[PDB]
Design a protein around this motif. Structure first.
Motif, PDB file in Angstrom:
ATOM      1  N   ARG A   1      -5.461   5.138   3.159  1.00  0.00           N
ATOM      2  CA  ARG A   1      -5.685   6.336   3.960  1.00  0.00           C
ATOM      3  C   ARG A   1      -7.163   6.462   4.366  1.00  0.00           C
ATOM      4  O   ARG A   1      -7.889   7.378   3.960  1.00  0.00           O
ATOM      5  CB  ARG A   1      -5.158   7.537   3.195  1.00  0.00           C
ATOM      6  N   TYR A   2      -7.598   5.515   5.206  1.00  0.00           N
ATOM      7  CA  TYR A   2      -8.991   5.401   5.625  1.00  0.00           C
ATOM      8  C   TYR A   2      -9.051   4.845   7.037  1.00  0.00           C
ATOM      9  O   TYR A   2      -8.073   4.298   7.551  1.00  0.00           O
ATOM     10  CB  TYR A   2      -9.809   4.495   4.710  1.00  0.00           C
TER      11      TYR A   2
ATOM     12  N   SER B   1     -10.936   2.317   8.203  1.00  0.00           N
ATOM     13  CA  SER B   1     -11.067   0.876   8.291  1.00  0.00           C
ATOM     14  C   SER B   1     -11.070   0.271   6.906  1.00  0.00           C
ATOM     15  O   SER B   1     -11.312  -0.932   6.772  1.00  0.00           O
ATOM     16  CB  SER B   1     -12.363   0.506   9.006  1.00  0.00           C
ATOM     17  N   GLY B   2     -10.877   1.074   5.872  1.00  0.00           N
ATOM     18  CA  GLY B   2     -11.029   0.560   4.538  1.00  0.00           C
ATOM     19  C   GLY B   2      -9.787   0.717   3.691  1.00  0.00           C
ATOM     20  O   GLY B   2      -8.701   1.037   4.198  1.00  0.00           O
ATOM     21  N   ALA B   3      -9.952   0.466   2.393  1.00  0.00           N
ATOM     22  CA  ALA B   3      -8.877   0.585   1.429  1.00  0.00           C
ATOM     23  C   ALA B   3      -9.481   0.767   0.048  1.00  0.00           C
ATOM     24  O   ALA B   3     -10.459   0.109  -0.281  1.00  0.00           O
ATOM     25  CB  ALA B   3      -7.986  -0.653   1.464  1.00  0.00           C
ATOM     26  N   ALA B   4      -8.883   1.641  -0.754  1.00  0.00           N
ATOM     27  CA  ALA B   4      -9.261   1.831  -2.146  1.00  0.00           C
ATOM     28  C   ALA B   4      -8.230   1.169  -3.070  1.00  0.00           C
ATOM     29  O   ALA B   4      -7.012   1.299  -2.870  1.00  0.00           O
ATOM     30  CB  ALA B   4      -9.395   3.318  -2.452  1.00  0.00           C
ATOM     31  N   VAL B   5      -8.715   0.449  -4.079  1.00  0.00           N
ATOM     32  CA  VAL B   5      -7.845  -0.364  -4.924  1.00  0.00           C
ATOM     33  C   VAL B   5      -7.928   0.123  -6.355  1.00  0.00           C
ATOM     34  O   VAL B   5      -9.002   0.084  -6.963  1.00  0.00           O
ATOM     35  CB  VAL B   5      -8.203  -1.852  -4.840  1.00  0.00           C
TER      36      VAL B   5
ATOM     37  N   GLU C   1      -5.624  15.276  -0.699  1.00  0.00           N
ATOM     38  CA  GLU C   1      -6.096  13.928  -1.006  1.00  0.00           C
ATOM     39  C   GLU C   1      -6.182  13.089   0.258  1.00  0.00           C
ATOM     40  O   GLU C   1      -7.231  12.509   0.561  1.00  0.00           O
ATOM     41  CB  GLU C   1      -5.186  13.263  -2.031  1.00  0.00           C
ATOM     42  N   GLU C   2      -5.102  13.072   1.043  1.00  0.00           N
ATOM     43  CA  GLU C   2      -5.130  12.357   2.312  1.00  0.00           C
ATOM     44  C   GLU C   2      -6.366  12.724   3.129  1.00  0.00           C
ATOM     45  O   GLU C   2      -7.069  11.846   3.636  1.00  0.00           O
ATOM     46  CB  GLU C   2      -3.853  12.628   3.109  1.00  0.00           C
TER      47      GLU C   2
ATOM     48  N   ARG D   1      -9.679  11.388   1.601  1.00  0.00           N
ATOM     49  CA  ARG D   1      -9.940   9.951   1.811  1.00  0.00           C
ATOM     50  C   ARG D   1     -10.208   9.616   3.274  1.00  0.00           C
ATOM     51  O   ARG D   1     -11.120   8.851   3.595  1.00  0.00           O
ATOM     52  CB  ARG D   1      -8.774   9.104   1.296  1.00  0.00           C
ATOM     53  N   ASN D   2      -9.415  10.153   4.173  1.00  0.00           N
ATOM     54  CA  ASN D   2      -9.511   9.755   5.564  1.00  0.00           C
ATOM     55  C   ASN D   2     -10.733  10.356   6.265  1.00  0.00           C
ATOM     56  O   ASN D   2     -11.360   9.697   7.097  1.00  0.00           O
ATOM     57  CB  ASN D   2      -8.242  10.181   6.257  1.00  0.00           C
TER      58      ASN D   2
ATOM     59  N   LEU E   1     -13.678   9.530   0.476  1.00  0.00           N
ATOM     60  CA  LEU E   1     -13.735   9.771  -0.965  1.00  0.00           C
ATOM     61  C   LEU E   1     -12.868   8.803  -1.737  1.00  0.00           C
ATOM     62  O   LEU E   1     -12.024   8.110  -1.170  1.00  0.00           O
ATOM     63  CB  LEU E   1     -13.290  11.195  -1.287  1.00  0.00           C
ATOM     64  N   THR E   2     -13.045   8.769  -3.045  1.00  0.00           N
ATOM     65  CA  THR E   2     -12.236   7.878  -3.865  1.00  0.00           C
ATOM     66  C   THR E   2     -12.020   8.496  -5.232  1.00  0.00           C
ATOM     67  O   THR E   2     -12.699   9.453  -5.594  1.00  0.00           O
ATOM     68  CB  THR E   2     -12.896   6.465  -4.056  1.00  0.00           C
ATOM     69  N   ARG E   3     -11.065   7.971  -5.974  1.00  0.00           N
ATOM     70  CA  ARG E   3     -11.017   8.381  -7.359  1.00  0.00           C
ATOM     71  C   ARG E   3     -11.944   7.475  -8.157  1.00  0.00           C
ATOM     72  O   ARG E   3     -12.185   6.327  -7.772  1.00  0.00           O
ATOM     73  CB  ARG E   3      -9.597   8.269  -7.908  1.00  0.00           C
TER      74      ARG E   3
ATOM     75  N   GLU F   1     -12.038   3.091  -8.835  1.00  0.00           N
ATOM     76  CA  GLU F   1     -11.359   2.380  -7.774  1.00  0.00           C
ATOM     77  C   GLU F   1     -12.408   1.564  -7.057  1.00  0.00           C
ATOM     78  O   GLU F   1     -13.593   1.900  -7.073  1.00  0.00           O
ATOM     79  CB  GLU F   1     -10.701   3.334  -6.756  1.00  0.00           C
ATOM     80  N   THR F   2     -11.982   0.502  -6.404  1.00  0.00           N
ATOM     81  CA  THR F   2     -12.913  -0.244  -5.585  1.00  0.00           C
ATOM     82  C   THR F   2     -12.582  -0.009  -4.128  1.00  0.00           C
ATOM     83  O   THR F   2     -11.417  -0.089  -3.729  1.00  0.00           O
ATOM     84  CB  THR F   2     -12.863  -1.741  -5.881  1.00  0.00           C
ATOM     85  N   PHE F   3     -13.616   0.233  -3.341  1.00  0.00           N
ATOM     86  CA  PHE F   3     -13.471   0.498  -1.925  1.00  0.00           C
ATOM     87  C   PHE F   3     -13.933  -0.734  -1.167  1.00  0.00           C
ATOM     88  O   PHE F   3     -14.913  -1.381  -1.543  1.00  0.00           O
ATOM     89  CB  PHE F   3     -14.258   1.744  -1.491  1.00  0.00           C
ATOM     90  N   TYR F   4     -13.154  -1.104  -0.169  1.00  0.00           N
ATOM     91  CA  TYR F   4     -13.415  -2.232   0.705  1.00  0.00           C
ATOM     92  C   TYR F   4     -13.324  -1.681   2.107  1.00  0.00           C
ATOM     93  O   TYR F   4     -12.442  -0.871   2.383  1.00  0.00           O
ATOM     94  CB  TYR F   4     -12.378  -3.374   0.535  1.00  0.00           C
ATOM     95  N   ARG F   5     -14.225  -2.081   2.990  1.00  0.00           N
ATOM     96  CA  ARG F   5     -14.031  -1.748   4.386  1.00  0.00           C
ATOM     97  C   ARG F   5     -13.847  -3.042   5.166  1.00  0.00           C
ATOM     98  O   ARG F   5     -14.399  -4.085   4.809  1.00  0.00           O
ATOM     99  CB  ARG F   5     -15.178  -0.881   4.935  1.00  0.00           C
ATOM    100  N   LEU F   6     -13.064  -2.950   6.232  1.00  0.00           N
ATOM    101  CA  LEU F   6     -12.614  -4.082   7.013  1.00  0.00           C
ATOM    102  C   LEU F   6     -13.029  -3.918   8.471  1.00  0.00           C
ATOM    103  O   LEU F   6     -14.181  -3.622   8.764  1.00  0.00           O
ATOM    104  CB  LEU F   6     -11.086  -4.217   6.896  1.00  0.00           C
TER     105      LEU F   6
END
Lengths: 196, 24
Positions: free
Chosen positions: A183-184, A186-190, B5-6, B9-10, B14-16, B19-24
């Protein structure tokens, strides 16, 4: 009332037909409808009478593609039906979830998304649409994907493009991927878990 | 609530914690 059933039975027992006919205490239309009304997994039934004392019954069942919510089932064409769990629980099927009128809608998602994921050998174990139309998927390897309401395809592509680097990352730190939240922009939380 | 939450994050990225955040 001697009975000859034709058709691809998987869920309906003889005794279901016997007890539907015995239930009335006759006419070929009344019993066809009564088989319909007592066996909710019958999609079609035709009842031809035949001398000596025979009832030849053609049965067509629904064919579940998935469990629907939990107790119910949904076929490829969007039909919502229920089988008593006793007869259902040796089956391993994907789980679909949605609010109560939404099977066709959830199934449409499920197809699109499962098909995309198939193109790189990820398979869908569960797919859950919420009232809000937010989507949360579960892969066979129990990774949960959180898709929210937006472009679910685009976010799913993110997961696939990004999965390898997560798998080596998971390998290194000796931990499993627990979920991926897309829910981003361009990114993703894992989220990670300990290994089992 | 899940809606929250949605948005968390969007709109804010934000994150919990953990967690690991990656951007693409």
């Amino acid at each position: 009332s001697k009975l000859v059933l034709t058709g691809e039975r998987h869920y309906t027992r003889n005794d279901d037909i016997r007890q539907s006919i015995l239930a009335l205490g006759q006419d070929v239309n009344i019993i066809q409808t009564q088989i319909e009304q007592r066996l909710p997994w019958i999609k079609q039934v035709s009842v031809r009478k035949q001398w000596p004392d025979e009832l030849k019954i053609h049965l067509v069942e629904y064919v579940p593609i998935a469990r629907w919510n939990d107790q119910h089932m949904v076929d490829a064409e969007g039909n919502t039906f229920s089988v008593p769990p006793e007869r259902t629980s040796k089956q391993v099927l994907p789980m679909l979830y949605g609010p109560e009128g939404s099977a066709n809608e959830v199934l449409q998602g499920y197809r699109e998304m499962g098909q995309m994921l198939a193109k790189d050998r990820f398979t869908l174990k569960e797919a859950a649409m919420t009232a809000r139309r937010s989507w949360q998927l579960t892969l066979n390897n129990d990774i949960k994907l959180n898709l929210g309401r937006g472009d679910t395809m685009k976010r799913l592509a993110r997961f696939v493009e990004l999965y390898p680097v997560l798998q080596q990352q998971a390998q290194t730190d000796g931990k499993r991927i627990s979920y991926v939240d897309l829910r981003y922009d361009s990114g993703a939380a894992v989220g990670w878990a300990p290994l089992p | 609530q899940e809606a929250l939450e949605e948005r968390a994050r969007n709109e804010l990225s934000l994150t919990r914690p953990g967690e690991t955040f990656y951007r693409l």
